[model samples]
Target: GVQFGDFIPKNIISFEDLKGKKVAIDGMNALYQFLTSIRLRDGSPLRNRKGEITSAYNGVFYKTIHLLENDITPIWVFDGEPPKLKEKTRKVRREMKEKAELKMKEAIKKEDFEEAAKYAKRVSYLTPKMVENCKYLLSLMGIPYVEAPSEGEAQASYMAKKGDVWAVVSQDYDALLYGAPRVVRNLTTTKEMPELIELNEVLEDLRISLDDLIDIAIFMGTDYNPGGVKGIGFKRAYELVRSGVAKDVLKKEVEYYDEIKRIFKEPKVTDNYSLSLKLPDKEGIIKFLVDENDFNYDRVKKHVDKLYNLIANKT
Candidate 1:
């Protein structure tokens, strides 16, 4: 929901470069995307009896398998508590969820199952119990997951800045503002190519300092701060942030420099985490997938077999 399209620069990246890389993924976003898209026709989500969603399992499981098979290490970063200020966007989304639910029923009635499924995914489902399930699966697979103090993307970006990982793998440009040294976007997509965004390169190309770049992004509208200055386009925002004139600046009107800056640059996190790879608990994975999720017994084994083969080769 953070739109920095006007501020962030991107370059086409070859997948070959990602070999042997470590990526800290924004876990919540990845799970939500996977869970929603993993729905069945007629817009029904993948679930067990009693109707608990397993979209998290499909997304975290298969997606992580692909990365491991490609020799890329991934750490899942989950959002813990969000900053009070960032709730502005959440409030709006909550209202939209109510509206989207109505639309979902309408589509289901029309038998446009695909469209209905798309609408069905619009509601939020990041329950604590649901997130716990994600953690359990990732743990069985021997993948490390983090609980960020706030804003999972910011934590990922900060870690990349610290050289803890090769890069932050996320689709959001907000990572740039959070000062990620490098970010790989579109990795979770079914698409073949992924794009990389380097903060240093972007600043150099724009001839703007990091602070000024964030200023540009904020002026052009951010998730925390919406509705950019009226009539202020990208170029105008850029010039204004880098200005010395009376500058027609709106810093006083809609600016939150110190707070937003701290949120990105000084996010709270626990440094007490490990990155060692481990063997997947196959029996544990089977229990959750088949016994818990009501997944087909034979189908789960087939996927598990491929996963085990890949693990043997990689580890």
Candidate 2:
């Protein structure tokens, strides 16, 4: 879940260097990544006794505690809703998924198992139940969350821009387009250290402003404009942006080029939220994760106690 950082550095960093660092997370994106990555062979995720999936819980809880133990605070930012254009994109994807299902059924009828599996892989979506469990866990654990007005990355990027957090965490290239001062990836994974992306360095290397970055993404392709401009290759797009011809060329090719840039540059984000790092509600979390969700209580307690002890001694 990481790339499009043509001119960015690896700058891999350890959690120990981030004492007292508060980073904003793309909560839904992280949850989606967890469910997608931490799943069974047939694509089913790890679930509890009642058959409810614990994918998000398995992902968030351990990762949060690891950060706390390292003295790095995190703020989980969830998407409130999406814009109309976003809905249009979703509609197209949904219809395509349904068609894939139909094709899979036919393939199954013909015993074409390979084609069926391919179709199934193309169809992926998150459920309300999964997000509900994730939010409930965050609340009981005293973890923080911000309800973004539209997109999670945009809101998280806004938080980074306002200095509410040192940087934003996501595998998405879109955060940089939103002008997040810094971008981080691999926070929850088993990577030896997290990869840090300095937006300042990207701008310097690309020799274009944030608006120009938006122009590059626009010509290269975006959620709004699928397949990108036919004539623009990645190198061509970079050249176009650097050579100061992207604005004019994009306008001539795409009808909504200007509108897309505006949305990325001036996305809807709020500044009224307050953040507090509260002590983890150990007993409540245990009740929810262990007693209710069927996670091993003893294993869960080991990390829970570690987080409490770590936070208790933090200056």
Candidate 3:
């Protein structure tokens, strides 16, 4: 049987419990996930009749509204400039896109439309406008958002650690490494209990102290750095750190072990984190996405109406 934690289940945290609770969202990560996970079957991007990108818009619009309707306060954090060291990850992403494109072309040659569509969707890129529109739609719906200096999820996790937010909301396993006390999943849709992973619980499962876990994560590679010693996965890293093998191994194999230790000490937190969460003017949202970008107003309005109805019923 799959393991389950004893924290309050979803049935307990009703729509009422969410009222006034602040949730920190990983904006860019969520947008990327939408682009990759949701798409049409022809390898063509999901778009309105006008042929503009709409996947991120559609995901955020419905998800943000659903949270607001349930009385949950969302604070979206968008990724800003990446740190210099993260260029490795950017390069890796580019390589992945290239590989996916090659696969798509091969699938087309074979007339395997399904495989090509899947590959194309995985290769979709999120644009600046798409990110802005999501922020704008969230604003129109009275959700708060902040553009992070680096990784959105990392910044969101920092917010959670400081007690400014109740939880960090994301689907990534990396949030746990960021030391968020509680991580909640499935915010887009669902009345189901979010799989809550507590930081202390993870420590217990790994059988090592917090400091050791941090060391292990650094050794395994973080967004801030890459190429941790070869062949070290999560489980192995945990075992090595728990068994006190990290220090001895690092002494023999790696230089600058102390520098690596410092990387995990603390993340940079911004002082200008307070941003307004006022709802955007309905006309403004419509004009930007529909008029300026030529998105489908009818579909956008349908989701908006659904959100309004849900909120009204709750009230």
Candidate 4:
């Protein structure tokens, strides 16, 4: 009898229980994942008839609606100004996308549509205005959101840890590293069942203490530290920590190991983070997504109706 984790409680709530619960979403992460993962068969990017980008909207609209239909209330949190350390990761991402675009161009030259499409999936960028637009749309839908001072996922994780939110919703393992009590993946949109990882389980699974887990993540590279150890992958990293070799290994390899340890032991409190669920002007959301972007209003309306119904039922 293999239990999933240290604690195996059989009576978890159903997906229907999501109704009326507040979920904090990492706005940029979701948008980027949608942009990269959702694409047509051809290498051409998803766009409106006017040849403007629309994949982010498409993914957000459908996913938001689906969550609403399932009675889950969503709170989108957008990144405002990131910490200085994140710039390196952004640069690396840009380099990767540039290389991917070159591959896509080569594939198109050979009439290899499938190959081009595969390569094109690697292209994505999240502008500040785009984040603002997403916040506005969520507001229009009456969903609450917070503009995070640093990473959106970190803010969401803090909320979940404090019990202000039911779960931190994201595709990034980084959220777990940030000490979120619960992290849900692929909520509502994926055909695959949603995966929920508990922070305690993560600590236990790796056979390391929470502090040690954080150290391992630092070694594996985070936005704060661009380059982790050269050759370590997820499994190897886990093995290092599990085998109690993390402290010594980090001492020798990580440049600022002592400072990183202190930071991990007592993370700086981010006081500026806040969220407001006050719905945005309905007309504004509708106009931006439906009128300006040519979104399918019929589809949008269905989700709106579902959200209203859930609120009514809850009250």
Candidate 5:
């Protein structure tokens, strides 16, 4: 996860603040969060009769309905191809999952379900089929989604910057570095009111320009430059960036500083996207979630009707 959030300031906001607004959401982030959190009593994922995971589907269906009922139009932005610089981060996550899997197996063999469940949280993964299923569900629900050329967070930020949406909704602070005008956090869960982070506010409070913020992030280590500046601490990184010596230190320590800066300052994004709050296809949603995925028919219908009625009545 990005570490710059420690230095960024955010304001608490109520869910009602998001009413009648269009928000661009990071699809992969939300899906990954769902797969990790929406688990069974023993830490296994919610599965249908065929043993296929339904965590993402459940989140997409129910969460979207909740947003619709609140009068918020969500535009899901998904990742397409990852930048080459992200391979190292992906490798690190893969290694982590490998270790977690072994621990989970050991716990299972020892009949310690609790320990197994603890390790299970780190082993959650999003398969290609799961992503496709989520996209299909979003389509059936009539929610718009955009496939970004590289990072979905970047695309969401770009949409916010372009005024295509009011704000970028995501769990991470990377959207701020990507230059989103406003980024909303904690939207995936009902734990508390979502926090609003304004780029200008952060810049003003930090007493630095956006480029200086990016420099500080690189010094603290971004996905592109992991384990940033070996001997530097978070406060030290901020100090160096604020002192205007980050460029000198970065030149001495990181050879790819320019590339990482480019990634944050000029991230790859797409303009080919459509956003419309159309009424959901009730029959299609039911057929897909119930008939195909084995979701409870009554429960699916209950929410689908809620979604349909919300949109239909809004017209």
Candidate 6:
């Protein structure tokens, strides 16, 4: 929830620029977006005949194929255990979900489908079973994935920092705080073209160090410390950090200031991951999506065939 959009500078980028690039994607982030947006008119999720949710399946199948067709190699990274500092943020989110559920029920009782749909999206929560299903589907599509020690964005940032991938794909500005060389937003979305934020360019534009950027993010608020300096905003946070008064602010106002900084500076990450592309398992994908998940057979067949065709001639 680090909202740094007002101050950060990003260059709009195209698929052509990212062609043949290795992108480390934040898997949970993308999956959450899928679950939140790909819903029925009544705000319920797209479910299989057996009542299992399939919105995430739809997202991964289509978007992964889109990326592959554009010659982009994506290494999906999933989140593991979250840091203790994030507990507060998680609690707040849980509370929001409770409220959303109540709102949704109220709207449904009134037959206000539109309002109900909005609240239904807010109540979307990804469970462990959904995560497992997503991973299996990705495997069937021959996509490589990594389970991170903590945050998926942190692991992806580490991968990009190590030059294992060209960039980290996430909409969260936290990726930059984690020190990703480049972060691309909207890559997983269908509406707009992707925007690229180069860490170095951002630093230069803001005239601050990476450490300063982290400090600014802390002042504004982050997952680790949701309610930042109550009154400080993006610009003022930048001013405070730049004018060298952030130290005083941190001392008086920010709890766990050092710990928060440490999280952004040296986030928990693992180097055990590998990047490799495999031929899409056409038969396996068909069985998983069509037979098992109740997806339309002909549609799954068409995309699976395209996936095989696009990558077949590439060594």
Report the lDDT tens digits of candidate 2 across residue range 182-292.
888888665456888888888887677878777777777887687788977567888888788888998999886766776677777778676776667899889988998
Q: Write the per-residue lDDT of candidate 4 for residues 188-291, one digit (tens) a residue.
A: 34655566777786666556676776766766675545668888755677678778888888888887666554433333334454444343354666678778
Which runs of model 5 end up more than 4 angstroms from their true locations?
82-124
Give the higher-lDDT candidate: 5 or 6. 6
What shift in Å separates residue 219 of candidate 4 from its native position after superposition?
3.5
lDDT winner between candidates 2 and 3: 2
lDDT digits (tens) for residues 199-280 of candidate 6: 9999998899998988888888887678888998888888888899888888688876777777767766788877876788
Cand. 3 TM to true fold = 0.71
269-288: candidate 1 lDDT, tens digit per residue: 66766777677888888899
Give Cα-based local distance difference scores for all models: 0.73, 0.76, 0.64, 0.64, 0.81, 0.83
Worst 10 residues of 5 by lDDT: 87-96
| Residue pairs clashing, model 4 | 19-71, 139-280, 144-277
Give the Cα RMSD of candidate 5.
Answer: 6.7
Q: Give me the displacement of residue 302 in model 4, in angstroms.
A: 3.9
Judged by lDDT, which candidate is best? 6
Point out the worst 10-residue segment of candidate 1 by lDDT: 87-96
Superposed model 4: Cα runs more than 4 Å off? 1-14, 17-20, 82-123, 188-191, 258-282, 312-315
How high is each candidate's TM-score?
Answer: 0.80, 0.82, 0.71, 0.73, 0.85, 0.85
Worst 10 residues of 4 by lDDT: 1-10
- Model 4 residue 136 CA deviation (Å) reads 1.1
Error of 3 at 74 (Å): 0.8
What does the lDDT read for residue 203 in candidate 6?
92
Candidate 5 lDDT for residue 129: 69
